[PDB]
Write a protein that binds this DNA or RNA. Structure first.
Length: 156
RNA sequence: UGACAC
């Protein structure tokens, strides 16, 4: 069975998160928080109240593989210092700082070959690895991704 | 409005 995690997959909204470097994803799991473009933080903040739960799926541009997924624990923060994100070329911190708490359901990576049979109809019907940051994935599509993640038992 | 698949 999928343990208590299944409780989210029955009604949660899934979101495709991208990153320009593996360092932002690695830093986000080391901090237990995340940040993204202000148009995406808005979609995640509004999805938080309208859904039973929100799930953020992590990915890197050059990797094409998923680095993990985590449940949005809270809305974006403000009035305090931001996280030390690794800003890629042409990026600036002014688009960030809306840092939100997240709960890592799995720290492990997952190659797209396991999810190759999946596609997002809430998009151009393209595979789950394509599409921009903040793209909303279908309820049952993103659910299936959570079922095909490997166990994090490699950590200990 | 600024982290698509390569």
């Amino acid at each position: 069975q999928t343990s208590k995690l299944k409780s989210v997959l029955q009604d949660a909204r899934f979101f495709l998160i991208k990153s320009n470097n593996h360092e932002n994803v690695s830093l986000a799991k080391a901090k237990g928080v995340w940040s993204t473009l202000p148009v995406n933080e808005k979609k995640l903040n509004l999805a938080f109240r309208s859904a039973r739960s929100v799930i953020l799926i992590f990915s890197v541009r050059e990797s094409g593989k998923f680095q993990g997924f985590a449940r949005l624990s809270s809305e974006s923060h403000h009035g305090g210092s931001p996280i030390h994100w690794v800003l890629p070329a042409g990026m600036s911190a002014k688009m960030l700082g809306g840092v939100f708490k997240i709960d890592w359901i799995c720290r492990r990576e997952l190659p797209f070959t396991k999810s190759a049979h999946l596609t997002n109809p809430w998009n151009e019907h393209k595979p789950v690895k394509i599409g921009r940051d903040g793209q909303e994935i279908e309820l049952e599509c993103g659910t299936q991704l959570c079922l095909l993640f490997p166990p994090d038992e490699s950590i200990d």
